[PDB]
Amino acid sequence: MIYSKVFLKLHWGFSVVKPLAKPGFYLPPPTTLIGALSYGKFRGVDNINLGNVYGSPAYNFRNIMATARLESEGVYTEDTGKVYIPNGRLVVVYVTDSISKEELEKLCWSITRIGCKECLASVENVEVGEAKKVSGRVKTRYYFRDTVKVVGRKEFLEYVTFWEENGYIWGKEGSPVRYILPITTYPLASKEVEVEAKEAYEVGGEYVVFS
Amino acid sequence: MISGSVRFLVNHRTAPVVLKTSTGYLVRYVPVISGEALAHAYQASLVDIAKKEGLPVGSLSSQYEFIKFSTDEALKIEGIKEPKDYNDARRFEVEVMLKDVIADVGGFMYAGGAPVRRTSRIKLGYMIPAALYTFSFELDEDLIAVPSTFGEKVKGEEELERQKAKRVKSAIKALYSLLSKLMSLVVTKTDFPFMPEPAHDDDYIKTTIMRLGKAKGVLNGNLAKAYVINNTVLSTVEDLVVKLEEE
Amino acid sequence: MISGSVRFLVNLESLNGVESIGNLTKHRTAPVVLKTSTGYLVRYVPVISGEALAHAYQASLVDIAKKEGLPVGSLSSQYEFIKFSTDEALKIEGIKEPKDYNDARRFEVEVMLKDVIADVGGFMYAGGAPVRRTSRIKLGYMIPALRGDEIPAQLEAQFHVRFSNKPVAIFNVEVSSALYTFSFELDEDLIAVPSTFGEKVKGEEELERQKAKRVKSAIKALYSLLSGNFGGKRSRFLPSMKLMSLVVTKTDFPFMPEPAHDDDYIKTTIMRLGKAKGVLNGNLAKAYVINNEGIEVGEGVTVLSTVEDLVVKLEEE
Amino acid sequence: MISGSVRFLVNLESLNGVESIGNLTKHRTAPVVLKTSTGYLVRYVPVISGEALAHAYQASLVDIAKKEGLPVGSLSSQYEFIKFSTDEALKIEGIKEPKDYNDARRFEVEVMLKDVIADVGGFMYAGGAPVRRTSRIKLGYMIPALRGDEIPAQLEAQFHVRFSNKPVAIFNVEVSSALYTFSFELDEDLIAVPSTFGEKVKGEEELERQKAKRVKSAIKALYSLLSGNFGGKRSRFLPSMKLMSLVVTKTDFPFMPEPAHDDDYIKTTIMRLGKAKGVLNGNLAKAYVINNEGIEVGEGVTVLSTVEDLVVKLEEE
Amino acid sequence: MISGSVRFLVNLESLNGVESIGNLTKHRTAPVVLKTSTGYLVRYVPVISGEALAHAYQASLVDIAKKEGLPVGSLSSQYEFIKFSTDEALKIEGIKEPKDYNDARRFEVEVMLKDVIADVGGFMYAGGAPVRRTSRIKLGYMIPALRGDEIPAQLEAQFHVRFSNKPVAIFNVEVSSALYTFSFELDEDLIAVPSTFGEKVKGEEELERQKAKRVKSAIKALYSLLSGNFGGKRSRFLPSMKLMSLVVTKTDFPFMPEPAHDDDYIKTTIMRLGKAKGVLNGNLAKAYVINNEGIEVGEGVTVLSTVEDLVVKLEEE
DNA sequence: TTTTCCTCGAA
RNA sequence: AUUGAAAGUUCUGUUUCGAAGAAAACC
């Protein structure tokens, strides 16, 4: 299991509207991150034959662990929801084992937009290394699943609904999965939370929790 | 109307002037004589002449203090009641106009509950060297001893009409003090507004004489006379004063 | 239309004043933007406003109108040009207020028959049916000429004393000297013609009869402004005025001469007039020039000597 | 298309006003962002709005159109440019409202045949089938030149009095001085050409016949703006205008010159025009320059002397 | 690919209105957080959206395509960029709908041959067998520079009145001024290339023939955006624009420069470009910079002067 | 440094 | 190539008409 950290300097912000009055998401779901990663390899195509349906060029990349967190202060606005955080910074962690270090680094240095077309995003730096599997008490910042037990004070918890990979095909809805974020609603920011994760990955001083 | 231009030769306040030369224009600081140092002499001569010829003179103006009727203390000293309202104002003026000649020819102002104004019938200006000091003066004798406030007729105007001739004669006589080494002098008597050329140029008597006839023709006037003194041509200012009194 | 530009030279002057501070009377001052060799600068210079000139012009017009038999309003017979703004003036003069927009025309004509001032000088009445009439003479501020890099102007304060035998008396007056320039415009083609749009109303024939007399009086009135009879504090601060340069243009089309800032503003306006007559399809363009300083004038332009000559010439045409 | 940039120097002016407070009349002001050696600053400076210029241009167009025989609408015959926005204007002029989208074209042509103003200046009708027509002349605010670190403009207030004999009368007016700049654009290739898409409708041949005259009048109308006949309060606050620098470009492709802020906006725009003709596959590019202040211009560009010359040259081509 | 970051300066501007309240038109604004020693502040700052820029770019592309002879669709000949999105548009244009997924590529090519805007601008068709295509140009919001301890952006409201002779007519408009910055991306390598997997279909030879001209037209369409021909309300509120800094990079691999927020974003993007080119095995990577606000640049960069030179250099490579 | 005023109207 | 792919809240309007800080005073 290898890992790669990437620092992103967003230009003006990002916005991913919810499925099904168009409120937005406070933080991008993992599916957007995986697609932004897959852009580096499948550039120039917008439809492929999966075998039975034309879903997307990012259906192949569906077993890569990816999380992200803020590093500055932004504001959510409904004026189609948006998150204004110009010149801000975002940290994204990619943990996987299905590809070598070279593939992951080359794909990671080739990220240009997260969300919709206007959400341009530069890449500042990446760091590639190995991660250690742990199960003891840890302190984490990145958003995790709902089932992760928490021991601290329930004072900085937000609840959102995201989708699985099944939403990569047109004319279909991704499966609903509840996630928990350690985020302050206004102004937007992120705070550390101590948990007792069953399976977490130390990736260089930040214990990323997954399940 | 009597409008005159006078040039003088005499052999400390300073003022700025804009001067013209061949290269263009310049700003200079030149000694001057104030415009109120000349009014005092004229008014003092008027007081002396009016007292000599039996004309009424105010109590305060009998002394050479020209506060006139500005303050309520002056009103108390002279002994005239203050005005009550706007309608009474005319009456007040007549009273003020029937005791002091200076308050008529030279104008006055009273400030208070019912302020009353009367602009001067003689207008003067600063004395600037052309040292060859020059100046100009203007008088409108057609309004001497004539009430200026608008209102109904009041008792006592008959005395004003009787004394109008002597008042105008005294006002004309009073110019001798200001006119008195004279070099060039121009006097013009008209029935229309007119302003003679200043004494800034060597050739100005000809210009104003030429303009006089054209102005009379264009203004539908009926009287225009000019008098010139250089040292019609006369010799002494006394003859000019006598001619002005006669005509 | 009769347009013109005039250059003046005035010394030891205070014709326009403003609110006093302590025992000091302040002369009006204003900021001006000037172009030097080094760039653009802002300066504070004494000026003379444009409403003293209008007052003097209207006073002379009242005098001439009463002299030659034209009607003059009641309040404006006194030198108080409130005209017809308030209801008290209407009550004094004896004119009913307009009822609706349709009646508006009538009102103007009635007013237009009682005072020449309300005709030549324009007026305004505000109410249920507001009625406006723009002045037929347009004037501007009296600014010193913005020539070269140094403004030819100066301002100072002077100290005066009242004398008394029982002290228990001191004041200060501001005095200025400048090379004043100003331009003016008068469209005689619209004098004694109603400006409100509507239907003909009885009483306009008498209006047409007096049109020549009204135009003649309005033209004659400009002698006051061109001669220098305006302003205040003339009893003891009589200015030493003088004329230096003057240009008057008579045209059938809109036109404005060059302001008297640059030393060459007669040649430029003559050339612009010659071209503008052709470009605008005009049929009349005449120029009169008075030059007493010795600057370049041009060719094919009448040269006069005084102001009465110009008044006569303007009357004749 | 004909584009241009113009620089004026104005003193002791109040041409556009805004809502008054007490006895004070306020001049229009706006914020600008200016770059200084220390960084970027925000300032508040006097401005002149961009709609008074349109009113002046349209009034001159009405005058010339009536003078030379072109049709002019009923309400626009008086200087009230409501055009055809409301139903009352249509009722007065005598035009039926459009029924559906397909009839829309017809409506425009009818409106396009009665008033030159509704053609050159564009118009809007809102209703069941809204009809839009963009103005063929484009104008903007008049702003002081943002040159260097100090803005060369100033604004102050002045004190004025009305005279009466029975006191029972005081007002204040804002007066400004500035170095104004503004740019304009006019596309004559679309004058007398319908803008709404549809089928040919009877009455367009007459439109084609008058195209040259309409273009001639539209080009002629710019003389007022380029000479300085606009704004308000001209009767007693007549400004002292002056033209310093002007550049006009005639091309067959979209193009816009540099704003007149920096001292070098003529050389830059001439170079840009020379390159832009090549880049866009153009076939015509001409430039006219008037320079009275003495700044760098360039080479191979016509140098004029006045504005009437520019009007004639624009008419010829 | 070609990417760019651009820094503009705009004064007395309104190019993006929003839902009017009463008789007032409001600007589009966004919230930002400014950190202070005392704490934090939430400011509301003007922005310009990115859809207006897309509309301006597509209009310029329409003009250039119709001028150079490229095919343009029936509807897109008019400035109604609905594109072939609904059944009615297809019926108007005359293209059969795709039958199944396998024919999808075929359909695209047909569309890709009838219209140029549908290729560069991208289209989407919703129906039984959806066919999608992403735009080849991407543009971001125009938001001012959050540089330093201040936000150089101000916004006010102004008062306008329509004048009439029968009063029974007042509106307000917000005007902004700011230091705007935006970035853009354009992948000319994918122009005229189908965007679906499948066997080659007849008609792609015509696309191969037309590819060079289509790429040239798409590059030429950038001149309008970089010159300032976007927005709205340009007839009466024509803005003033100026260019301060611009960095455009031409590469062979995905890359985008730093946002133009920090006062030093030219050095950082050069360093990042060097690292990315080293790590991604790139062969060509060039940078063009236009510098007018005097910021630090570095070494290894081509220095231009205007935007026409940039467009020429982009066309050559 | 004393007196007087210190905006009206219609959108 | 990412609930992603396609979208100008756009056109039309003067803050205008009018009004003297004026009267009196010795360095």
* CB pairs B-C closer than 8 Å: 101
Residue C3 has which token pair?
Answer: 């347009």
Amino acid code (one letter) for C223: Y
Burial of E190 (0-12, 13-18, 19+ CB in 10 A): middle
Angle between helices E51-68 and E204-220 (to 10 degrees): 120
CA–CA gap between residue D67 and residue D90 (Å, rounded): 24
CA–CA gap between residue C131 and residue C123 (Å, rounded): 8
CB C220 within 8 A of CB C315: yes
For an interface test with C, give the residue of B5, B13, B18, B33 to mutate (most C CBs within 10 A): B18
Query: Which of E17, E52, E8, E14 has the alpha carbon at shortest distance from E238?
Result: E14
CB E249 within 8 A of CB E287: yes
Reported as half-sphere exposure (CB side, CA atoms, 13 A), residue C58 has a value of: 30
CB A170 within 8 A of CB A149: no
In eight-state DSSP terms, residue B52 is: H
- C47 to chain B, minimum CA–CA distance in Å? 15
Radius of gyration of chain B (CA): 20
Find the Å distance, CA of residue E132 to C1' of nucleotide G4.
11
Tokens 């009682």 — which residue? C114
SS3 of D182-241: the string is: EEEEECHHHCCCCCCCCCCCCCHHHHHHCHHHHHHHHHHCHHHHHHCCCCCCCCCCCCEC
Method: cryo-EM
CA–CA gap between residue B159 and residue C230 (Å, rounded): 34
For chain C, say whether E166 makes contact (Cβ under 8 Å). yes
CB B139 within 8 A of CB B146: no
CA–CA gap between residue E47 and residue E178 (Å, rounded): 9
Q: What angle do CA D134, D140, D142 make, to 5 degrees?
A: 160
C193 strand G contact, CB < 7 Å:
no
C126 strand G contact, CB < 7 Å:
yes
Question: Given CA atoms C263, C269, C274, C275 in this order, what sign does their dihedral have?
Answer: positive
Question: What part of E 111-130 touches A (C-beta under 8 Å)?
Answer: 130
Q: Which residue is nearest to nucleotide F6 (CA to C1')?
A: D170
CA–CA gap between residue E280 and residue D261 (Å, rounded): 45
The neighbour count for residue D275, using CB atoms within 10 Å, is 17
Burial of D313 (0-12, 13-18, 19+ CB in 10 A): middle
- D161 to chain C, minimum CA–CA distance in Å? 9
Shortest CA–C1' contact from B43: which nucleotide?
A: G26
CA–CA gap between residue C59 and residue C229 (Å, rounded): 10
D23 strand G contact, CB < 7 Å:
no
Q: Which residue of E has its CA nearest to C195?
A: E165
The neighbour count for residue D104, using CB atoms within 10 Å, is 20
The DSSP annotation for C7-76 comes to EE-EEEE---EEEEETTEEEEPEEEEEEE-SS-EEEEEEE-B-SHHHHHHHHHHHHHHHHHTT----SGG
CA–CA gap between residue E272 and residue E263 (Å, rounded): 17
CA–CA gap between residue A42 and residue D180 (Å, rounded): 55
D134 strand G contact, CB < 7 Å:
yes
Asked if C154 and B27 come within 8 Å (Cβ–Cβ), the reply is: yes
Query: Which of D290, D144, D119, D143 has the alpha carbon at shortest distance from D221?
Result: D119
CA–CA gap between residue D3 and residue D273 (Å, rounded): 12
Question: What part of D 71-110 touches C (C-beta under 8 Å)?
Answer: 78
β-pair type (D29-36, A158-163) = unpaired
Query: Which of E272, E263, E117, E47 has the alpha carbon at shortest distance from A112?
Result: E272
The neighbour count for residue C208, using CB atoms within 10 Å, is 10
Resolution (A): 2.9
In eight-state DSSP terms, residue A166 is: G
Cβ-Cβ contacts under 8 Å for C98 (sequence gap 6 or more): C104, C106, C107, C125, C127, C128, C129, C131
Residue A154 has which token pair?
Answer: 């329930």
Instruction: Give domain limits for chain A.
Output: 2-209
For chain D, the first-to-last Cα distance in angstroms comes to 12
Query: Cα-flanking dihedrals φ and ψ of residue A18, to 5°?
Result: -75, 155
The DSSP annotation for B131-162 comes to --EEEEEEE-GGGTT---S-S---TTHHHHHH
Burial of B232 (0-12, 13-18, 19+ CB in 10 A): exposed
B171 dihedral zone (left: phi>0; alpha: psi -120 to 50; beta): alpha
Q: Which residue is nearest to nucleotide G3 (CA to C1')?
A: A19
β-pair type (E2-13, E240-250) = antiparallel
Q: In what order do the strands lie in the sheet with A158-163?
A: A144-145, A176-181, A158-163
Question: Given CA atoms A7, A13, A14, A17 in this order, what sign does their dihedral have?
Answer: positive
Q: Would you give the distance in Å from CA E56 to the centre of its chain?
A: 8
Burial of B32 (0-12, 13-18, 19+ CB in 10 A): buried
CA–CA gap between residue C163 and residue D75 (Å, rounded): 69
Cβ-Cβ contacts under 8 Å for C113 (sequence gap 6 or more): C71, C203, C206, C207
In eight-state DSSP terms, residue E22 is: T
CB C267 within 8 A of CB C296: yes
SS3 of A48-70: the string is: CCCCCCCCCCCCCCCCCEEEEEE
Residue C157 has which token pair?
Answer: 């304060």
The DSSP annotation for E215-277 comes to HHHHHHTHHHHHHT--SS-TTTS--EEEEEEEEEEE-SS------TTSS--HHHHHHHHHHHH
CA–CA gap between residue C259 and residue C147 (Å, rounded): 11
Fold of A2-209: Alpha-Beta Plaits (3.30.70)
- For strand F, which nucleotides have at least one atom less than 7 Å from a protein CB? 1-11
CA–CA gap between residue D140 and residue D180 (Å, rounded): 12
Angle between helices D211-220 and D51-68 (to 10 degrees): 130
Judge B/C contact: 3 or more CB pairs < 8 A.
yes
Cβ-Cβ contacts under 8 Å for C260 (sequence gap 6 or more): C5, C6, C7, C145, C181, C182, C183, C245
- E137 to chain D, minimum CA–CA distance in Å? 20
Collapsed DSSP state (helix, strand, coil) of residue E111: helix
The DSSP annotation for C154-187 comes to EEEEEEEE---SS---EEEEEEEEE-EEEEEEE-
Query: Cα-flanking dihedrals φ and ψ of residue C290, to 5°?
Result: -120, 120
- For strand G, which nucleotides have at least one atom less than 7 Å from a protein CB? 1-27
Which subunits count as partners of chain A given 3+ CB pairs below 8 Å? Answer: E
Residue B96 has which token pair?
Answer: 């003020």
Chain D positions touching E308 (Cβ under 8 A) are 272, 275-276, 278-279
Tokens 């404005």 — which residue? C256
CB A9 within 8 A of CB A125: no
What's the length of chain E?
317
Residue D147 has which token pair?
Answer: 């040159």
